[PDB]
Amino acid sequence: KQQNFCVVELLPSDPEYNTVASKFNQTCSHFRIEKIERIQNPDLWNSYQAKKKTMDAKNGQTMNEKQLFHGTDAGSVPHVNRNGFNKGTYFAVNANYSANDTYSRPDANGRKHVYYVRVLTGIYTHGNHSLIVPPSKPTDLYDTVTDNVHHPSLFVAFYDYQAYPEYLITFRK
Ligand SMILES: c1ccc(C(OC2CCN(CCCCNc3ccc4nncn4n3)CC2)c2ccccc2)cc1
């Protein structure tokens, strides 16, 4: 219930850093990465995994999890580290979407912030612009919605503990 957390700066020489840096740079190589940290929130993680286990048991062969990007402002970083992303929350397939100044707002020092997030996209459908929760597939609903079902570029998650902000990327132009 507390959801306290630790923030650990990864070594650039760490394979985990390289993995995260590399996905970022598939579309954001022209930005400069200042650092990458891992967010360690035990409580938030178990709640996330609980829902994942529940989703795993219900969606058959579906690979319910994706690692997506989320741009946010500097000030929200503490709130997200603790509460995650609890009219849902939007995640990008490609980091250059999230890197836009509208989402990863540059702070007074010029730093921009993008989370590399584990998201339970689960089973999704095309999303219209007027959803508080996902529509019905009965009364059982989709897990997320997307701009395009075959070639997605963003997802929208609507429930608590459906995303974990595993890594934060601090970077600049
Ligand atoms: C007609 C139809 C729908 C509406 C509105 O519904 C949605 C439209 C704006 N959406 C925000 C999208 C921002 C992108 N979000 C990110 C944010 C970080 C980020 N990092 N990487 C990617 N992203 N995407 C959500 C709500 C509405 C709004 C308020 C009240 C009522 C209705 C209005 C008129």
UniProtKB/Swiss-Prot annotation:
It comes from the Eukaryota. Auto-ADP-ribosylated. Induction: Up-regulated by IFNG in macrophages. Down-regulated by IL4 in macrophages. Residues 1-173 form the PARP catalytic domain. Signal peptide: none annotated. It is found in: Nucleus; Cytoplasm. Expressed in macrophages. Interacts with STAT6. Interacts with PARP10. Interacts with PARP9 in IFNG-stimulated macrophages; the interaction prevents PARP14-mediated STAT1 and STAT6 ADP-riboslylation. ADP-ribosyltransferase that mediates mono-ADP-ribosylation of glutamate residues on target proteins. In contrast to PARP1 and PARP2, it is not able to mediate poly-ADP-ribosylation. Has been shown to catalyze the mono-ADP-ribosylation of STAT1 at 'Glu-657' and 'Glu-705', thus decreasing STAT1 phosphorylation which negatively regulates pro-inflammatory cytokine production in macrophages in response to IFNG stimulation. Belongs to the ARTD/PARP family. This is Protein mono-ADP-ribosyltransferase PARP14. It comes from Homo sapiens. The gene is PARP14. The chain holds residues 1613 to 1801 of 1801 of the full protein.
